[PDB]
Amino acid sequence: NKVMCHVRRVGGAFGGKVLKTGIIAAVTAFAANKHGRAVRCVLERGEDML
Amino acid sequence: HGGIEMGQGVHTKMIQVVSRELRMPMSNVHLRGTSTETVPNANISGGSVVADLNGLAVKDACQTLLKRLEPIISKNPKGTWKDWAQTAFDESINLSAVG
Amino acid sequence: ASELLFYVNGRKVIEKNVDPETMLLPYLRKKLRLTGTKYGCGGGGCGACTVMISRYNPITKRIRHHPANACLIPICSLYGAAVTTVEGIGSTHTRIHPVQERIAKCHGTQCGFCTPGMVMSIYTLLRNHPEPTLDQLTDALGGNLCRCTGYRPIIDACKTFCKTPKLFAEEEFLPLDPTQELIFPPELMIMAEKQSQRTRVFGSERMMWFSPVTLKELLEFKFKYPQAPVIMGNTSVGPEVKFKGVFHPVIISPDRIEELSVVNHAYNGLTLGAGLSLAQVKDILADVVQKLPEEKTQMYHALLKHLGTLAGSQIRNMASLGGHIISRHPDSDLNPILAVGNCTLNLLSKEGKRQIPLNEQFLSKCPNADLKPQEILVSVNIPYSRKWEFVSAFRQAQRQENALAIVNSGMRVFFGEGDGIIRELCISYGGVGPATICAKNSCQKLIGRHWNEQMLDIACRLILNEVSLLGSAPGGKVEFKRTLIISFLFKFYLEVSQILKKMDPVHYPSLADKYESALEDLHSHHCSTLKYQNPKQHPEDPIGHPIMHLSGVKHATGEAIYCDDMPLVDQELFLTFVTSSRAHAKIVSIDLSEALSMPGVVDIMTAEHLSDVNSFCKFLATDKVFCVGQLVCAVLADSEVQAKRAAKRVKIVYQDLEPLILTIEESIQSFKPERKLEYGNVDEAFKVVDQILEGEIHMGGQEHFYMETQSMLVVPKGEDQEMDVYVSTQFPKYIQDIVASTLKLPANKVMCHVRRVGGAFGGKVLKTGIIAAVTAFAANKHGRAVRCVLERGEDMLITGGRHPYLGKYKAGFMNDGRILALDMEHYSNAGASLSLFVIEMGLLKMDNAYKFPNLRCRGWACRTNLPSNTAFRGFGFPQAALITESCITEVAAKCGLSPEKVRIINMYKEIDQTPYKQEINAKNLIQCWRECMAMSSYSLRKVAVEKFNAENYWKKKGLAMVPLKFPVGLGSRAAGQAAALVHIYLDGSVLVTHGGIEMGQGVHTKMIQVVSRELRMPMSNVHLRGTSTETVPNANISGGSVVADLNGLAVKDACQTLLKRLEPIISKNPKGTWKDWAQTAFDESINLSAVGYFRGYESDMNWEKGEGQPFEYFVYGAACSEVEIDCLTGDHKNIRTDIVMDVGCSINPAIDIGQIEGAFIQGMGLYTIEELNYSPQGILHTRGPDQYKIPAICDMPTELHIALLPPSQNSNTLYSSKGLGESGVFLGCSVFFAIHDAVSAARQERGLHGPLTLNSPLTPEKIRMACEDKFTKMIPRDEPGSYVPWNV
Amino acid sequence: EAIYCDDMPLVDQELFLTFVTSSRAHAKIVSIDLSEALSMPGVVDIMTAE
């Protein structure tokens, strides 16, 4: 009840925006909470494929 | 609803459902997005069934809403949705429904 | 060149090329993102922006901590210092500080907006006095205002720091560890330990700021820039640049120069540094007074007296002595005392040392006695008093402290060894003209005379024409000021003709026995007790338990986000309004050309630019204005500063129109709809009565004075014209409507979101929506988020207040006081626009506790050229019920019976009928009256007050008791409908929301208590985020005393639905967690989301027949109040108040007792000290003694007892609870009628029978002028139409 | 005009997160040196599994 997830749209997914997305969100949210700051994580194509 | 728009047009289909079920133009319906705050415990948007299943849940809410209003609709069949909504409020009929 | 370096909450802050005009409050909030420190009023009055300032003294090796109001601190003054905000002392993500823990857990926060200020005042004092006395703590909070709590719970929190069935566990509060406090930043010690002589320079395009750090340099800068102000505390210069259009290109702001902070104990007296704070002067003189004998400490006593009341703790710690003297404010409390005391000023220039006397010419700013432009005040000499020299100072304001004087004085006499021939005499007054004036000519004529009443009568005459006021004098109150002038003269006569008696008993006469009480004045302690109920119920069920407000700690730590605390959204603009300055005028033209060209300005909208969307069901004035404060233009800019700058350059030319209607009587000269109730047959009843009586009472309005001003942020999404509206409002659905309408959009495109409101009391609805509509129009037009936050001055002008009322009555009664006939007329003042609903509720609730067998009741709303008034906590009842109590106490007078005998025999019986034919069980009305008579010990205290008044001529006491029937219910069933939405997530945790708004009344706390009971889970497992049209649609307004009742029923409804679905799962695994039940429900395809709905209480009123069932239930109560008045000054003191209250079964007695106290104090203010002064042109006065004053700690009754009548079941309402909230406001008039009683006792003894009608608010002016004496007869008076008055 | 996740405006004082990823397919992590990385402009924090 403390954490809400909001999604307007996704620019394609085809199954590849689930487990690994969540890991990155978890790590990102840990940082955000630790420093009391909004944190943004966007991957470049090379990193993304890897 | 719990479904996610990834480009497959799930949101377009749900408004088509709403438009049929409440008998109103698609221009009268709006959707903003998807949120755990509004619809809890939703399954993954996958398995070729996002529209199928969320369509059935949207239809379910619409029908519930139409059942509540049928007394008001029969008593004023040529009235707008604005009139039906207003008299429903004036008669203490709830205009929010989970599907 | 220079860099600004200071600390905030332990962290270093560096600003390079800093703008000198930056004030600390916006800097903290915007640049550092510390939003705990709030804006309340921006003049230093309220204390919402209170912070701690710390400095290391490098010579004395000591760290000094003082409180201050951040709104008035320019950041360039903070160089080398350490600021501490509320966030600095603790948080929920570190450790909470005990001050924060206790103010919250003692229920000392309601809306919470004042909490950070309260916390920082208490923190700062505990840092200086770790083991304090309550006196010191309540003195620290003299500067801190609160509109919700009534101060009692904040006082209780303070007591827990003093080594001297409850609502909180004191024993569980963790102790104040004085050694684990915040360390003063070491770098600032190291900087201080190396006295830089280099003078600091900060520049911008508009302003130069020099901080000289040596005396040499200060005089160097005072020569170059002779006309630059020397800023010390900025509590004189600051407030006048804010709202008197003053501007200084050059500022000089010296650091601690040692010669400016001298404390010399001379042989002849003492010399005090001009840079000492007023707080430090109060301490120096307190010590001197105790260390020296009491005829050399005569001046120092009079200064201490007036420093005790001067402003509050924050301003005293900021304001300097030199600043005070040089400011030369006409209402200055210290200058008239210094004037009379042979005080001299030590001036210093680049050319040399020089000494001038502090006399009338100096206070008049005659350049011969003034400082020359190139010199500065170093120190002032206050000499010791000689033997047979006596000094006295008096003052009268609107309340006892943190309020500017209407009139004050300093007076001195010298006799010189023995015989009572007066050899010197100085009499100085303030508030009686543009400067502090000394009656020197009168004083010359009195030299040689003896001290007795022969000289008083002549002295009074010959001052009353020397120190005269024109009837049109600014400040108003001319006949009151006239009286105070001679009344203070009388008090001085008495006072000093007693030290003479003391010192020389045989040669001087003793005072008359009924006169002594004139000398000692009225100065409090704050005691209270609270009775309520508390076996068969489960220990995990929270219903009935005094649960702390869910945000209570977040209030205390400043982590609660209010609308303006939301972060800056990318590229947001600010909107500010140009408002009408005329009451009824043609708008001939608007020139925007200068405004439009100025820095940052994006757009300026008039009514033309809104075209066909300038109204709803009009926003901006078109071609006429119908009151001052009406919206005219809207200025949109890149920043708030730029917006207000540009707004002040918009030129509007007007042409006044007739008639200019201001009063209710003027407004009675087309067609008004009437409202009427008739019971029995009043025309027949008038034939068979013993007596008939006509009368009337005017009643003033009331500003809402929510501590959070009007605030909103409108954010366009950028898709489909979607708007999100974050606004401090009581009615989101209405915001959604007016914004959507304005944008020509469907309602599904606009969503309104509200987390919390910092108080509202009805004043955050219609006018809020207009501003939101205009704001959203701009946002949409420019594709930008737009923020609109109002300053206090604009807010009071643009928003309305409570409706002022006129009551006329004809009462036919028996000689036993029973009222068989009653004809009644109500008139509300509506302002520019319609208000009829307020008349309707007035008439329905008019009866209050009494059965009028034959009754005609009629009302009319009256449009005037004043701001449009709105609904308020009470909704016509505080006005309507005051009319009927006035009518009672008049009938009581004509029967020779106490009003309380007349009340008790006109009351409803156990079973009885209302004027609108609703049946009532008034059993609890009787009990409330019985218990209040018992609890208060009314009968014994009645003779105590009669006894007192027989022995005291210049001080009277009074006592009164009033009953309460407050009916509750709305017009229709549909108005009472309510909805909620409940989710259970698969971990078992719950999210709930509903249509109700949290304004500080604790509605959200109560809903979680409901959820906790209904789903049988701890409150820690439930969460609520806020209120939104996106989650719960079509919700009604949060008002009518029923927000919790109705949304509670809807929350319960969702919970029960959810529990029904789960009962199969629960029976099959009864010892399972909610996580298990939720998970298996998901696994079995059972839905864990439910809408809850309550249809509304059945309700109706046929206004044609005058009959119906409008009300679902009635809150019953009674209240007793005792006061003592000063008949010479019109001052008063609330001694004691006793309140008994039928609440049914309280869902939360902490919250419900909080609402009783809050409502009571709000009503107390309405009826005594709250007063709005309008000019004959309809301009609101907002400056000097015309300042609007809500109740402070000094107004809270010395004793306060509150009982909750034992419950008795209401199957119809939520857990048999009664929605109080509005109820306690009317109980404030117990104070009104207690004062009314006291005035009558002075009028009976002196022999002035016949018509005594005192109007509300019962101000000190009204009290004094009612206590007629030789001084009231003596004053010179003016012809009605000969002059134009400052007010009325 | 369609807003995707990264199109959302900069929220006040937001930080950015980026990952260091493995360059070996199956290897022991003998050590991680963050001292140079931690000293560089703008860096707020570097989190490892510890």
Ligand SMILES: Cc1cc2nc3c(=O)[nH]c(=O)nc-3n(C[C@H](O)[C@H](O)[C@H](O)COP(=O)(O)OP(=O)(O)OC[C@H]3O[C@@H](n4cnc5c(N)ncnc54)[C@H](O)[C@@H]3O)c2cc1C
């Ligand atoms: C909320 C509030 C409540 C108040 N209540 C009261 C009250 O109850 N009773 C009362 O009597 N007063 C009251 N005041 C007035 C207050 O006492 C004065 O504003 C204050 O004493 C001025 O001191 P300062 O250091 O702030 O002056 P500043 O504003 O710093 O300076 C004001 C003027 O003094 C000049 N000045 C200062 N020091 C020197 C010097 N050494 N040499 C030459 N010129 C100098 C400046 O150039 C400037 O023109 C109140 C003010 C506020 C804001």
Ligand SMILES: Nc1nc2c(c(=O)[nH]1)N[C@H]1C(S)=C(S)[C@@H](COP(=O)(O)O)O[C@H]1N2
């Ligand atoms: N444009 C677009 N089409 C798409 C996807 C997507 O990410 N983008 N995902 C596919 C996958 S993997 C699934 S499971 C389905 C899910 O949506 P549906 O059940 O409504 O077809 O959409 C398919 N079509």
Ligand SMILES: Nc1nc2c(c(=O)[nH]1)N[C@H]1C(S)=C(S)[C@@H](COP(=O)(O)O)O[C@H]1N2
């Ligand atoms: N602290 C606080 N208490 C308050 C208010 C407020 O704005 N702040 N408003 C009052 C008014 S005018 C009303 S109508 C009720 C509404 O809430 P309730 O019905 O839950 O009592 O709260 C009252 N108590």
Ligand code: MOS
């Ligand atoms: O079920 Mo699609 O995300 S493989």
Ligand code: MOS
């Ligand atoms: O019903 Mo309260 O907002 S007067």
Ligand code: FES
């Ligand atoms: S005291 Fe600074 S906000 Fe009112």
Ligand code: FES
């Ligand atoms: S809680 Fe103090 S102002 Fe509302």
